[PDB]
Amino acid sequence: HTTLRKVTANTAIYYDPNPQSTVVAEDQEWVNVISPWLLRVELDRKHMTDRKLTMEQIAEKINAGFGDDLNCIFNDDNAEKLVLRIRIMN
Amino acid sequence: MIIPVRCFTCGKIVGNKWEAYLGLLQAEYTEGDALDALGLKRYCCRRMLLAHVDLIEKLLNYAPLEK
Amino acid sequence: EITPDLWQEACWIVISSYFDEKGLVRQQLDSFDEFIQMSVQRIVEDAPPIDLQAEAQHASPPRYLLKFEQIYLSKPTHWERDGAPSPMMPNEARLRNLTYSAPLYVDITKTVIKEGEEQLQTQHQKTFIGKIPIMLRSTYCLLNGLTDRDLCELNECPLDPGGYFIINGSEKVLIAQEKMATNTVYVFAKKDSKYAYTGECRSCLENSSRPTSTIWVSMLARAIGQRIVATLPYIKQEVPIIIVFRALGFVSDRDILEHIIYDFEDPEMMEMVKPSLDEAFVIQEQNVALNFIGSRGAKPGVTKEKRIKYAKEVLQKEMLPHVGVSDFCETKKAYFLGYMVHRLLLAALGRRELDDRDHYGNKRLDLAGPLLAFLFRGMFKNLLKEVRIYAQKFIDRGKDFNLELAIKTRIISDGLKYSLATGNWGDQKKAHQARAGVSQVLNRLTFASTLSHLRRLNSPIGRDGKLAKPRQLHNTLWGMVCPAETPEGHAVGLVKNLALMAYISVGSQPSPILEFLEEWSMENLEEISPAAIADATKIFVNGCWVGIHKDPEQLMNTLRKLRRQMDIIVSEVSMIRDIREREIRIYTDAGRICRPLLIVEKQKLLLKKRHIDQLKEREYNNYSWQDLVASGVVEYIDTLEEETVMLAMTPDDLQEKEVAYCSTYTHCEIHPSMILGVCASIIPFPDHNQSPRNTYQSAMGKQAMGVYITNFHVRMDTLAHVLYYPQKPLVTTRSMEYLRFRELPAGINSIVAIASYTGYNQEDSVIMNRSAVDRGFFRSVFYRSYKEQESKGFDQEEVFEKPTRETCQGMRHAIYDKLDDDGLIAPGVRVSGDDVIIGKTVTLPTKRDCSTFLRTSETGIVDQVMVTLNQEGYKFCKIRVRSVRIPQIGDKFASRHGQKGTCGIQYRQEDMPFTCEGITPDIIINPHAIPSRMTIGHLIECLQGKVSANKGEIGDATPFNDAVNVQKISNLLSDYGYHLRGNEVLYNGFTGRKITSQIFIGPTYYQRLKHMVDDKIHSRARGPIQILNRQPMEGRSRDGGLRFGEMERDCQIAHGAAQFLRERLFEASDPYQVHVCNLCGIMAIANTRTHTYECRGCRNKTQISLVRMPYACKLLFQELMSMSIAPRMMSV
Amino acid sequence: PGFVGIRFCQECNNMLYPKEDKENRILLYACRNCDYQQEADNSCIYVNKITHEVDELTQIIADVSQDPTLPRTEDHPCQKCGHKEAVFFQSHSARAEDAMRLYYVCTAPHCGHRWTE
Amino acid sequence: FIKDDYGPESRGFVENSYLAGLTPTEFFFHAMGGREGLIDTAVKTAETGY
Amino acid sequence: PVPPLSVRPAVVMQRNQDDLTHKLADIVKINNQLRRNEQNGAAAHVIA
Amino acid sequence: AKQDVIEVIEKAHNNELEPTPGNTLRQTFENQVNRILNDARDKTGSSAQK
């Protein structure tokens, strides 16, 4: 059994007025891109590659569990940092 | 209480040796010299005086029941 | 100068000084002395005066105060209205079954105002409250400071340690009772609960009437998550801590957080404190929080201003009494409660670790002093609340009152006497509620047993519990509790004795420490702001947060400097600096268990050749242990201070230049053998044995028979056992000379041969030498005492006389000619079972006897007969009977290593094997008892005993001596003409052929235990019967029968012996016949002589059945019918 | 990442709570007692480190050096003052996932240096 | 023992036999170890008989 | 039903009554008191 | 055996000890120490019987 606590390093929430603004410097969101209060969780490569998951799998699990009440914006499996951002749709 | 009359193991008379043993210890004699000055060659007889505690003296400090 | 390689004598010299200046019951004596000196005074003075009015008016009322102080206590006195009162000798109290008590006196000042503004106060000096039982050899006992010659003149034993009470002529010993330490914060984490962490601090004022008011500060175990609650005394539900602070008086939020998190730059603390903050953003002022607490109170007020006052009273007095109860102590209580919350958060974040419950730093010992204080306080309150009732009953009519009649002197004395005599520690009404086991009857079978019973602790946790954690030997038991000594029954680890040099602190006022502290550079809580509280260190005194200091160092050194010269801080006070966590705690309360340790500077002891020399010439220079303490050479270190200190086992071996291990020692142990107790300090080479063997020897040392006390002939005592020829052991520890074991030994240095001779010792048994037993080997005499007192009604007068057959009706077949005409036997008369000893008859409204018969199968001789008057003035007689116990087969014998065993056979000297000389072993034990038990100490004792008996020296078996070993002992033995390993060539006693194997033989100190076989053997053949159910009685004395229990029944079922099972449970116990109706299975009425069998309720009288039944079954059926159940037994 | 820290109202000294000024679409911290507002400078509300990679050196304090019961070694010197003797010990902290790692504290007081090797 | 001492002598290992005797630390540790078995012997009965 | 003397034996001058006999004595005391009150007084309050 | 325990302690202190899969650093250090001590005790016992 694996919860999302096992794989994440730390979790933080911000108040980004514009999703386009990207208060955190992340060109992945720049190239990828309605609520201003967002959610951000940082995973670690260690448990991620130990249990063989993907950001796509985690995002589809979130979308199935919670429906289209929120959209997950996940960084690709290329950067050293493991980010997925969470909003809440209106 | 009091020194036994005979050694439990040997049976050699030890009852008469206690006062002489104390007298010899009231001198330069050590225990090992007093025991064989009294003629105790076997350790069965030697322990009879060596390990004896003379409690009759502590018993006599109490006043008797009668007079 | 420094003392090298003289340690083996210097350490034992200073130990001898310690045991000369302090006895072995010093904790008992000091606790009782401090009690009767100051604690009774403070209890009698802090009681509030009582003011009492009339019934509010008489026609269309003044009061008085009655305040008293300045208690007086006198020495024990004895006689009442028959002669001028005289002091009570303790031996006289033992003989006459009196209570060795002392009267205490107070002087009262009743000041009364009635009218006209005229105040008259009348003082009554030496008002009598009662008689307090007093401990022997105490500072007000009549044997205090008496010389040995005077003690012998008073028929008292000079070797008797004292420390016990004589009540109804029976020795009572207050067993020390463990408890969790008070006024200290403990953060725990119970596994399965709604909350994860919980912080408790049970709190007590300086011996106030209020009990331990325990407050818990807890954190929930998972929205928001992790709220902090604080269940409060006299509050039904938990209350969030922020509401508690707002009720305490802090309107703001920053001020509250200043009392919990001391450094605001730590956001991890804030992230866990805000979930509790956002719980209570609806209370903003003090009064609404007071209302919130009052609503949750046990007594909810009907109006708002009643809940306000109730909750204010709870916060003022119930919560945290030790930090202060006064007009304005809100800031101090808030600081301490915020500290408690901070402690809980530190455990929640993992910055610190959870406190251990078994850590005996967290434990306190309730000795005679504290226990008698706790019980006397309650009885004194009960006395006051009846003086008040008498005063009310006279002032309602308002005529006058007399305080002499008002004072009920019975209550205090009778409560003390009942509590100490029975053991139920509390009021007599709550006999089941009060804890028992305290104040046991002193065990007076051996001197070592008496010492062990006088030095004993007790853990008041429930027995027969499957939680082994409390029972386990904790690491903090080093040097304060004997690791070996503990009972093997259902009290393993719960009942633990006291180490040798272990001393229990007696308590003192912390006020001098407070004035000393407040004048260096520290600040009280009220002076500073929490801005500078994070970088400095918190000072605790007896668990209450007193202040804050910027420089922990050079104040720790200052406190140690004062304690090492006894300037202001006494030696028992312990100062503890926690370093990684900034607390610095000072403890002064009573019950702290501590032991003396040497002081070590850079790498050198402060004990010097000059100290050893001036203390070796003692009794002339009187440089005692107290002077050694005053020299700043030794300190008393408890467990708290033992955590923060670095010890060395041996100065020579652990303070030298080498591959460095510590090089930063602070203390050194005087001698490691002092970690043992009293019964475990008599074990030779105890480190060469398996520990369960040592525990069993510590248990059986209390059962070895010997001269248990010097004055055993004046001591009329039941179950007294003395050996004819006790001997001090040939091989001994250096710790026996302090237990006085070489003055009152229990055992004989027997020559044992560990061999399989015939097979009568195979399963842990032993062969004895019949000739040695004839010569007096282990021969003893058994003293049993019989008491009786005449009296009880208007005309049923008891009287001692010879019962005469034509006059008295009820008589046994026993012969009464052995009695003298006064009704007693003269001492020196041969007696046997079912022989009358005390001829006592009661008048029959001709006469019926109540004569005391000698216990069946005793068959002894009367030693002495004493007649006297009890405290009721009636004739009282005690008779002691001698009965010698020649060692026979089956008598339980044991060594000093837990090698017990019953004699299996007794061979004469001819039948017994022998050496090249005529030496035949007094004892032969099976060699198959060594390899699994692994009592290598037994073999080394048997070797060193031969070495010592040949050398002329007394063998030394100090546990950790390291100056003697098997190789040295063997080399010493080889010089005396024996095989170096103790083996000898014995010859067979029957055939004369030398035994092919060589026999291991030598003198070993065996003990004779009280478990004789003549005191256990019994049979039965249709003897006496119980009264309720007609089954055989129970007990050896009552000629009872053995119990064919539920497992024996199951075993017979498994055998499939149904006829034997029925024979056992039906005919061999209680055959019985009952008559039952055939229509209804209810028992009928049978009149056998007229053969009229009728079952009412049916009117049949014709069809009636007889069924054979156990009487217990019939009585079960009758009980069921009484419970309205109808067990109907149809035979069809 | 960092840690968010609670700071208090200057009027009544109470805990601020995050709010969105919907008109300007900007974060505001609002005291629920009084009408005080203030603009937030961190833009972060809540941070939670689940991996809890903690630098124990911050919780280690300098006065631990004079503890008689701690081991002492001269093999590892201090870095600023080059003092030869150093005091070392383990985490002494609960929830230390996997750490036998030694933390060192320099003696010769007023140095108080702390490092890890 | 020094703080955080995981060595064999500091955690209960007894390098001495019953012949050479036990150093006081080893004696205390062996007593504490045997206390566990002694406690188990008493506690086990009230469960096994039941 | 009151159990017989065999179920609740009384020893002689320790006569001493049984623990159940004392409770039965209390039972009969209160039953008689309740009875006599319910005919004569009939207060309907003390009866409760 | 004592030297081996000391060097295992050194490897654990210098973070040179890799945790055994299925175990944390503390329990794998405990396992190494117990293995070394048990092997030493077995070897000494076997030498005794020899």
Swiss-Prot record, chain A:
Coiled-coil blocks: none
Cellular localization per UniProt: Nucleus; Cytoplasm; Chromosome
Domain of life (superkingdom): Eukaryota
Post-translational changes noted in the entry: The tandem heptapeptide repeats in the C-terminal domain (CTD) can be highly phosphorylated. The phosphorylation activates Pol II. Phosphorylation occurs mainly at residues 'Ser-2' and 'Ser-5' of the heptapeptide repeat and is mediated, at least, by CDK7 and CDK9. POLR2A associated with DNA is specifically phosphorylated at 'Ser-5' of the CTD by CDK7, promoting transcription initiation by triggering dissociation from DNA. Phosphorylated at 'Ser-2', Ser-5' and 'Ser-7' of the CTD by CDK9 (P-TEFb complex), promoting transcription elongation.
Family: Belongs to the RNA polymerase beta' chain family.
Domains as described in the record: The C-terminal domain (CTD) serves as a platform for assembly of factors that regulate transcription initiation, elongation, termination and mRNA processing.
General function of this protein: Catalytic core component of RNA polymerase II (Pol II), a DNA-dependent RNA polymerase which synthesizes mRNA precursors and many functional non-coding RNAs using the four ribonucleoside triphosphates as substrates. Pol II-mediated transcription cycle proceeds through transcription initiation, transcription elongation and transcription termination stages.
Protein name: DNA-directed RNA polymerase II subunit RPB1
Full protein segment contained here: 1163 to 1263 of 1970
Swiss-Prot record, chain D:
Main location group: nucleus
Gene Ontology biological process terms in this record: maintenance of transcriptional fidelity during transcription elongation by RNA polymerase II; transcription by RNA polymerase II; transcription initiation at RNA polymerase II promoter; transcription-coupled nucleotide-excision repair
MF (Gene Ontology): DNA-directed RNA polymerase activity; nucleic acid binding; zinc ion binding
Pfam families: Zn_ribbon_RPB9, Zn_ribbon_TFIIS
Compartment(s): Nucleus, Nucleolus
PROSITE patterns: RNA_POL_M_15KD, ZF_TFIIS_1, ZF_TFIIS_2
TFIIS-type zinc finger segments: 74-116
Binding-site residues for Zn(2+) 2, renumbered to this chain: C78, C81, C106, C111
CC terms in the record's Gene Ontology section: nucleolus; nucleus; RNA polymerase II, core complex
Alphabetical UniProt keywords: Acetylation, DNA-directed RNA polymerase, Metal-binding, Nucleus, Transcription, Zinc, Zinc-finger
Zinc finger residue ranges, C4-type: 9-34
Binding site for Zn(2+) 1: C9, C12, C31, C34
Domain of life: Eukaryota
InterPro entries hit by this protein: DNA-dir_RNA_pol-M_15_CS, Rpa12/Rpb9/Rpc10/TFS, Zn_ribbon_RPB9, Zn_ribbon_RPB9_C, Znf_TFIIS
Function, in words: DNA-dependent RNA polymerase catalyzes the transcription of DNA into RNA using the four ribonucleoside triphosphates as substrates. Component of RNA polymerase II which synthesizes mRNA precursors and many functional non-coding RNAs. Pol II is the central component of the basal RNA polymerase II transcription machinery. It is composed of mobile elements that move relative to each other. RPB9 is part of the upper jaw surrounding the central large cleft and thought to grab the incoming DNA template.
Protein name per UniProt: DNA-directed RNA polymerase II subunit RPB9
Swiss-Prot record, chain E:
Region (Bridging helix): 23-50
PTM section of the record: The tandem heptapeptide repeats in the C-terminal domain (CTD) can be highly phosphorylated. The phosphorylation activates Pol II. Phosphorylation occurs mainly at residues 'Ser-2' and 'Ser-5' of the heptapeptide repeat and is mediated, at least, by CDK7 and CDK9. POLR2A associated with DNA is specifically phosphorylated at 'Ser-5' of the CTD by CDK7, promoting transcription initiation by triggering dissociation from DNA. Phosphorylated at 'Ser-2', Ser-5' and 'Ser-7' of the CTD by CDK9 (P-TEFb complex), promoting transcription elongation. Among tandem heptapeptide repeats of the C-terminal domain (CTD) some do not match the Y-S-P-T-S-P-S consensus, the seventh serine residue 'Ser-7' being replaced by a lysine. 'Lys-7' in these non-consensus heptapeptide repeats can be alternatively acetylated, methylated and dimethylated. EP300 is one of the enzyme able to acetylate 'Lys-7'. Acetylation at 'Lys-7' of non-consensus heptapeptide repeats is associated with 'Ser-2' phosphorylation and active transcription. Regulates initiation or early elongation steps of transcription specially for inducible genes.
Domain of life, source organism: Eukaryota
Subcellular location: Nucleus; Cytoplasm; Chromosome
UniProt record similarity statement: Belongs to the RNA polymerase beta' chain family.
Full protein name: DNA-directed RNA polymerase II subunit RPB1
UniProtKB/Swiss-Prot annotation, chain G:
Post-translational changes noted in the entry: The tandem heptapeptide repeats in the C-terminal domain (CTD) can be highly phosphorylated. The phosphorylation activates Pol II. Phosphorylation occurs mainly at residues 'Ser-2' and 'Ser-5' of the heptapeptide repeat and is mediated, at least, by CDK7 and CDK9. POLR2A associated with DNA is specifically phosphorylated at 'Ser-5' of the CTD by CDK7, promoting transcription initiation by triggering dissociation from DNA. Phosphorylated at 'Ser-2', Ser-5' and 'Ser-7' of the CTD by CDK9 (P-TEFb complex), promoting transcription elongation. Among tandem heptapeptide repeats of the C-terminal domain (CTD) some do not match the Y-S-P-T-S-P-S consensus, the seventh serine residue 'Ser-7' being replaced by a lysine. 'Lys-7' in these non-consensus heptapeptide repeats can be alternatively acetylated, methylated and dimethylated. EP300 is one of the enzyme able to acetylate 'Lys-7'. Acetylation at 'Lys-7' of non-consensus heptapeptide repeats is associated with 'Ser-2' phosphorylation and active transcription. Regulates initiation or early elongation steps of transcription specially for inducible genes.
Underlying gene: POLR2A
Localization of this protein: Nucleus; Cytoplasm; Chromosome
Shown segment, full-protein numbering: 709 to 758 of 1970
Name under which the protein is recorded: DNA-directed RNA polymerase II subunit RPB1
Organism from which the protein derives: Cricetulus griseus (Chinese hamster)
